Amino acid sequence: TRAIPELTKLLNDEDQVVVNKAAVMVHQLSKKEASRHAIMRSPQMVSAIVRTMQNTNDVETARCTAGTLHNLSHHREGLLAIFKSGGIPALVKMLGSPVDSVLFYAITTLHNLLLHQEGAKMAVRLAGGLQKMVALLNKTNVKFLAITTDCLQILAYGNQESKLIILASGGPQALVNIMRTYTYEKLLWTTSRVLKVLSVCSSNKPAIVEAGGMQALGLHLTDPSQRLVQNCLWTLRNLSDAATKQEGMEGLLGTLVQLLGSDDINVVTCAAGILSNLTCNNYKNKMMVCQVGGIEALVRTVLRAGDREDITEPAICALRHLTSRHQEAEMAQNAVRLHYGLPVVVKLLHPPSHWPLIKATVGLIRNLALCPANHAPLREQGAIPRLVQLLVRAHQDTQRRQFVEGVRMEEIVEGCTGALHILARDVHNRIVIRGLNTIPLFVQLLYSPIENIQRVAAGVLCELAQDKEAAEAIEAEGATAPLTELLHSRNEGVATYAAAVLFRMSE
Amino acid sequence: ADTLLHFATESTPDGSSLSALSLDEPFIQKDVELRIMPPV
């Protein structure tokens, strides 16, 4: 009723000299508690502060006004006043200020609003705050960058449109540069959090990966800050499925294999997940992983994981990738046995294991079975019976009809038959397989419409048919009719195996 | 062929706050409620 009303009138004065002088006193009063609260309680005052800030051409006035809002932003009533008085649009404009002071007041004020004022997120987005904040990432004050990147994290979290705007603005590039450039923990952390939120968007992934984000994030994997390390891993894992074709992952792969020995569950989980994706169809990555003891490191991880399928599934998939299609694939198949992985691998075929893990494990065993030295061990561990069980159970759900556990029982069918197909290259294994009354099922599978099933069914039958007894049993099971038809399949494998079974049955 | 595992973890386990900017202003304590209540 004394200073406030008067200063308010002065702020709205037509003469700038009077305005500027008022801005200084107002700012001064905002530094004292009693008068700060008085200012935030005057709608007309706050409104005059905001208008003056976004209209004045006096750097000193712009500093005192922004400084005033900054001081008011420490209280709920201040934050509310700023919000209701068109504060957001004004503050966003100030982010274009060439003055550091003004810029710092503005970003701090906006940050406080985004953190504690409901409705601020939308307002900032609406005012085009995302674009300016991203444009400010080329500044060099690390504390400033930390607050700015934190604003982006708040605005992008769970909001797809904000994520795309950050992308269109050149966000990925700028954020990766931060990771590759500074050492200030708080900035690296907040920045890794923005990249994490952006890595969830399938459209942001390419931009981040091409900018060298995998390497930039890889750089901090051994930092003392656990929150920094973990956020980099979450991000790297989200990106991994989009970086399977990237060159130069050798350094990262070494670190990742080392991280598999971490005591931190979240670290190991991400290390395994990233490794599985990076070893997907990339012979170079597979070789590098084998080179640094990846096989042993993964076997140890699986054993340590126990029933934690978040770890075993990606670790088992990695091992599956590593035991196939590359120079060291066979040595890898052999090494799994040497590092005592066969027992646990077979164990994973049983409960509490869920289908996703079951499918990956069957795949790995199919690969391991390619190494003759694993035949006896796998048999000794009870692989065959269980593989048959999964096949029977899976085959039934197929005919009695889709995704179960997120897995199609048709995949289990050819996966198990495919595994039994290879294990059947061993005499003793053939005795066990036939001893389980499987032939009738295999012959049945020849009628499947899925060529892959046909092929693996014809395959096991062919291996089995090398023994006279089994051959006559197959023949006696009525395999001749279906095989004669598959003999004419345009599928090389189907026709070849089919002819082979027929030939064997007539020796 | 090898298969990809599609990860998209955005919300991360919650588990020193950001250091204030260097400005010529008196330190001001933020409303108690703004420090005991999570972000909006």
From Swiss-Prot, chain A:
The keyword Ubl conjugation belongs to this UniProt entry's keyword annotation: yes
GO biological process, one term: positive regulation of blood vessel branching
Any coiled-coil regions, as ranges: none
Residue numbers bearing the Phosphoserine modification: 42, 97
Known tissue expression: Expressed in cerebellar granule neurons (at protein level). Expressed in the intestinal epithelium (at protein level). Abundantly expressed in the tooth, skin, lung, kidney, eye and brain with weak expression in the liver and heart.
Modified residues (Phosphotyrosine): 182, 184
This protein's UniProt keywords: Acetylation, Activator, Cell adhesion, Cell junction, Cell membrane, Cell projection, Cytoplasm, Cytoskeleton, Glycoprotein, Membrane, Neurogenesis, Nucleus, Phosphoprotein, Repeat, S-nitrosylation, Synapse, Transcription, Transcription regulation, Ubl conjugation, Wnt signaling pathway
Record keyword Thylakoid present: no
Disruption phenotype: Sympathetic ganglia-specific conditional knockout mice lead to a reduction in sympathetic ganglia size and in progenitor cell number, but does not alter sympathetic innervation of peripheral target organs.
Record's comment on post-translational modification: Phosphorylated by NEK2. EGF stimulates tyrosine phosphorylation. Phosphorylation on Ser-42 and Ser-97 by CDK5. Phosphorylation by CDK2 regulates insulin internalization. Ubiquitinated by the SCF(BTRC) E3 ligase complex when phosphorylated by GSK3B, leading to its degradation. Ubiquitinated by a E3 ubiquitin ligase complex containing UBE2D1, SIAH1, CACYBP/SIP, SKP1, APC and TBL1X, leading to its subsequent proteasomal degradation. Ubiquitinated and degraded following interaction with SOX9. Ubiquitinated via 'Lys-11'- and 'Lys-29'-linked ubiquitin chains by UBR5, leading to its stabilization.
Reported function: Key downstream component of the canonical Wnt signaling pathway. In the absence of Wnt, forms a complex with AXIN1, AXIN2, APC, CSNK1A1 and GSK3B that promotes phosphorylation on N-terminal Ser and Thr residues and ubiquitination of CTNNB1 via BTRC and its subsequent degradation by the proteasome. In the presence of Wnt ligand, CTNNB1 is not ubiquitinated and accumulates in the nucleus, where it acts as a coactivator for transcription factors of the TCF/LEF family, leading to activate Wnt responsive genes. Also acts as a coactivator for other transcription factors, such as NR5A2.
Recorded family membership: Belongs to the beta-catenin family.
Protein name listed in UniProt: Catenin beta-1
Species this protein is from: Mus musculus (Mouse)
Gene: Ctnnb1
Covered residues, full protein: 150 to 664 of 781
From Swiss-Prot, chain B:
Highest rank taxon of the organism: Eukaryota
PTM summary: Phosphorylated; phosphorylation enhances the F-actin bundling activity. Phosphorylated by GSK3B. Ubiquitinated, leading to its degradation by the proteasome. Ubiquitination is facilitated by Axin. Deubiquitinated by ZRANB1/TRABID.
Tissue specificity note: Expressed in a variety of tissues: brain, small intestine, colon, thymus, skeletal muscle, heart, prostate, lung, spleen, ovary, testis kidney, placenta, blood and liver. Isoform 1A: Very strongly expressed in brain but has relatively low expression levels in other tissues. Isoform 1B: Predominant form in all tissues except for brain, including gastric mucosa and blood.
Cellular location(s): Cell junction, Adherens junction; Cytoplasm, Cytoskeleton; Cell projection, Lamellipodium; Cell projection, Ruffle membrane
Impact upon substituting residue 11 to G: In MDB; sporadic
Domain note: The microtubule tip localization signal (MtLS) motif; mediates interaction with MAPRE1 and targeting to the growing microtubule plus ends. The basic region (residues 2167-2674) mediates the association with both microtubule and actin proteins and promotes the bundling of F-actin.
Medical condition linked: Familial adenomatous polyposis 1: An autosomal dominant cancer predisposition syndrome characterized by adenomatous polyps of the colon and rectum, but also of upper gastrointestinal tract (ampullary, duodenal and gastric adenomas). This is a viciously premalignant disease with one or more polyps progressing through dysplasia to malignancy in untreated gene carriers with a median age at diagnosis of 40 years.
Family: Belongs to the adenomatous polyposis coli (APC) family.
Complex formation: Forms homooligomers. Found in a complex consisting of ARHGEF4, APC and CTNNB1. Found in a complex composed of MACF1, APC, AXIN1, CTNNB1 and GSK3B. The complex composed, at least, of APC, CTNNB1 and GSK3B interacts with JPT1; the interaction requires the inactive form of GSK3B (phosphorylated at 'Ser-9'). Interacts with APC2. Interacts with DLG1 (via PDZ domains) and DLG3 (via PDZ domains). Interacts with alpha- and beta-catenins. Interacts with AXIN1 (via RGS domain). Interacts with ARHGEF4 (via N-terminus).
Protein name: Adenomatous polyposis coli protein
